[PDB]
Amino acid sequence: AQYEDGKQYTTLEKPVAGAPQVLEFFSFFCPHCYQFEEVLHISDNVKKKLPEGVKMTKYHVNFMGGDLGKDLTQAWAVAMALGVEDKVTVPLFEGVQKTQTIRSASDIRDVFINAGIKGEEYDAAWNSFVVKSLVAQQEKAAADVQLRGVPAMFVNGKYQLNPQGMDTSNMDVFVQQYADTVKYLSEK
Ligand SMILES: COc1cccc(-c2ccc3c(CC(=O)O)c(-c4cccc(C(=O)O)c4)oc3c2)c1
Numbered sequence: 001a002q003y004e005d006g007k008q009y010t011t012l013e014k015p016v017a018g019a020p021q022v023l024e025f026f027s028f029f030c031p032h033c034y035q036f037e038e039v040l041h042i043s044d045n046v047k048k049k050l051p052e053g054v055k056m057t058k059y060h061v062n063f064m065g066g067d068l069g070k071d072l073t074q075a076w077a078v079a080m081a082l083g084v085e086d087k088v089t090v091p092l093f094e095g096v097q098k099t100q101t102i103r104s105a106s107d108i109r110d111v112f113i114n115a116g117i118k119g120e121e122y123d124a125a126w127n128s129f130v131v132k133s134l135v136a137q138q139e140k141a142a143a144d145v146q147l148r149g150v151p152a153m154f155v156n157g158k159y160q161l162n163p164q165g166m167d168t169s170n171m172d173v174f175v176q177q178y179a180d181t182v183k184y185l186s187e188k
Contacts, residue, residue, distance in 0.1 A: 009159045010162055011159060012159070012160060017157065021054055021055045021155065022046065022050065022154075023058075024058050025059050026061070027064040027069065028096045029064040029065040032151050038094075039171070059141050060072055060073040061138070068102070068108075073138055075108045075126075077131045077134035080134055084112070092111055145160070153182065155185040155188075156188075161178065
């Protein structure tokens with residue numbers, strides 16, 4: 001077959017029930033995730049190939065960056081609660097990996113302030129129990145699939161993308177086949 005279990009994707013031994021249709025995990029400390037987001041724009045290219053209105057979920061992970069890595073998961077929960085993901089994704093990636101000016105929770109907060117999020121607005125969400133639940137959601141999702149590495153993408157909580165089975169000769173070709181695989185899986 002053109003698509004085969006173990007080539008472009010893998011099947012989860014224990015399927016996860018009720019998971020998001022398309023769920024990808026990432027870390028602002030993850031170098032591959034930087035390439036995925038800023039150079040390849042994988043998520044946006046996957047979204048453009050799925051049926052309009054499909055649910056695309058993106059969660060941060062804890063297992064990179066120790067203390068800061070957990071602050072970034074809470075900061076991503078803040079971004080999700082306020083709906084400012086598209087405003088802080090770039091500066092956070094570059095703050096951590098390009099300029100390396102993000103070394104504390106306050107430095108993370110600076111990115112939101114510079115992005116236009118009001119100070120009181122950010123601090124209220126940071127300490128809100130809505131955000132604490134969003135943090136638990138992200139952790140539960142990663143735990144459900146026994147996530148040990150990022151970047152990663154799962155489809156309907158049963159199939160896991162295998163980026164190792166694609167050609168990296170061409171930036172655009174790699175993205176296209178990745179997105180086509182997600183489409184194929186979502187139609188399974
Ligand atoms: C077209 O030019 C470019 C320009 C910028 C980046 C890339 C590029 C190429 C190859 C990969 C691979 C697979 C591999 O390492 O073989 C991964 C990856 C993804 C998720 C998890 C893991 C893991 O194993 O944890 C690895 O990300 C890649 C990114 C290519």
